[PDB]
Amino acid sequence: MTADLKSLAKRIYEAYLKNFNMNKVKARVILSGPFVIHDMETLCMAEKTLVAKLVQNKEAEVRIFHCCQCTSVETVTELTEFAKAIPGFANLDLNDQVTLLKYGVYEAIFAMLSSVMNKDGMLVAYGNGFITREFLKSLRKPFCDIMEPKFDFAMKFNALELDDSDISLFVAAIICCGDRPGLLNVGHIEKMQEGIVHVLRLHLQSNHPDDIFLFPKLLQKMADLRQLVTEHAQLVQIIKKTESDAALHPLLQEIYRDMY
Ligand SMILES: CC(C)(Sc1ccc(CCN(CCCCC2CCCCC2)C(=O)NC2CCCCC2)cc1)C(=O)O
């Protein structure tokens, strides 16, 4: 790993630490011991302290869904800044930057969600709440079907024991996929992708000498995320169609529009 490549890995890591409010070290410090949301009584208590304005109120499941949409809008914003640290990203055509982020953001979201999940629940609301996995399963259909596949992905992803230095590069690689539909400058993106993937490979070799297959394991996780997002988008479409009170924020509507 040349000084240039080591420096690119550090640039990407620092961009991740600066641009995401939650990092995995911070999340683990908190999860080691937030207000616990495990039932309807504690949901409504948390709403009154953490999202006071939101609480004529909607059904609980629809309130939770609205709050989730707010966090997605914010994460999409954070991922947009972050992507500028990727060599060549800001030099790409504005329209290609849109296409890459369009397909990439939810893969990045579900990868990063793993850092705040354990087998019993997830840290939420900027580190101030913890919602149990069983509570989310108790919601009425279809809302109970949103988070469980994400916990299942996260348990196996977390068993890889990645740190923030690895995850920042993996999120950059997700954004760089040169096989998204609609790309204008596939060739330049493939070269941008190759550069990030090359740094990811070398960094995993340095940082995880104990796991000689970690790079292909992460390529497979990328593919698993793409399929997780496809399925997620299908469920979101069901909710939007069948749930009168579950309208999508316009930014998220645009992200899902014509996605899959
Ligand atoms: C919104 C759809 C339509 S479905 C969808 C998508 C994503 C999620 C996970 C949202 N979430 C829980 C946010 C929970 C808020 C909490 C609810 C109870 C009262 C207190 C506030 C959360 O913490 N996300 C992290 C954010 C940091 C970066 C990693 C992701 C849930 C549903 C979408 O597709 O966007």
Rounded-to-integer distance, Cα 191 and Cα 87, Å = 10
Helical H runs in the chain? 3-19, 24-32, 40-50, 60-82, 94-113, 133-138, 148-159, 164-175, 186-207, 214-242, 250-256
Separation of CA 34 from chain center: 21
* Coil, strand or helix at 148: helix
| Ligand 1 center–CA 151 separation, angstroms | 13
Q: Closest by alpha carbon to 67, among 24, 134, 122?
A: 122
Note the residue count of the chain. Answer: 260
Q: Best mutation site among 23, 53, 68, 106 for ligand 1, i.e. most ligand atoms within 8 A of its Cβ? A: 68
Query: Any bridge partners for residue 35, and if so which?
Result: 129
Q: What is the resolution of the experimental data for this entry, in Å?
A: 1.5
* Coil, strand or helix at 257: coil
Tell me which DSSP letter residue 228 carries.
H
Rounded-to-integer distance, Cα 128 and Cα 46, Å = 9
25-55 b/e (C-beta count within 10 Å ≥ 16 → b): ebbeeebeebeebbeeebbeebbeebbeeee
Q: What is the DSSP string of 26-58?
A: HHHHHHH--EEE-SHHHHHHHHHHHSGGG--PP
Residues with C-beta less than 6 Å from any ligand 1 atom: 22, 37, 46-47, 50-51, 64, 67-69, 71-72, 75, 109, 112-113, 124-125, 129, 131, 146, 236, 252
CB 1 within 8 A of CB 202: yes
| Ligand 1 center–CA 68 separation, angstroms | 3
* Coil, strand or helix at 20: coil
Binding site for indeglitazar, residues? 72, 106, 256
Rounded-to-integer distance, Cα 149 and Cα 228, Å = 8
Q: Are strands 121-124 and 129-132 parallel, antiparallel or unpaired?
A: antiparallel
Residues 6+ apart with CB under 8 A from 78: 19, 20, 21
Rounded-to-integer distance, Cα 242 and Cα 222, Å = 30
Report helix angle 60-82 to 40-50, nearest 10: 50
| Ligand 1 center–CA 110 separation, angstroms | 10
Cis amide prior to 209 (ω within 30 degrees) = no
Q: Are strands 35-37 and 129-132 parallel, antiparallel or unpaired?
A: parallel
CB 109 within 8 A of CB 72: yes
